[PDB]
């Protein structure tokens, strides 16, 4: 199974300023994942371009599962992201009606 470290859209320890530079002028559905500001292992933050803004979505992690809200149903961050490449986040929040379309790639 592909690891999070090897995902093209996972940038690790980068700042919001760096994220905002990468998302400037990008279309809706542009996205990346970075480590959460808490700097706690297993805590990550999805940044999604929508409406010219950079929306921050916490990735929750409990009991070996991940997700945006309870119930947490995904076995990895990679599985969570790949799911929303093909389903809108509108289910999580009506203001996030886009799929994850355009990864910001580190490769």
């Amino acid at each position: 199974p592909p690891s999070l470290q090897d995902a093209e859209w996972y940038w690790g320890d980068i700042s919001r300023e760096e994220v905002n530079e990468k998302l400037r002028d990008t279309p809706d559905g542009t996205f990346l994942v970075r480590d959460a500001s808490s700097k706690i292992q297993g805590e990550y933050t999805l940044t999604l371009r929508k409406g010219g803004n950079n929306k921050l979505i916490k990735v929750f992690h409990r009991d070996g599962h991940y997700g945006f809200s309870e119930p947490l149903t995904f076995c990895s961050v990679v599985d969570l992201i790949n799911h929303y490449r093909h389903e809108s986040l509108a289910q999580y929040n009506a203001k996030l009606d886009t799929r994850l379309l355009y990864p910001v790639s580190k490769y």
């Binding site: 803004n53 950079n54 929306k55 921050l56 979505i57 999580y92 929040n93 203001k95």
Partner: peptide, 5 residues
């Protein structure tokens, strides 16, 4: 902050 619930 700019976190979406």
């Amino acid at each position: 902050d700019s976190y979406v619930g």
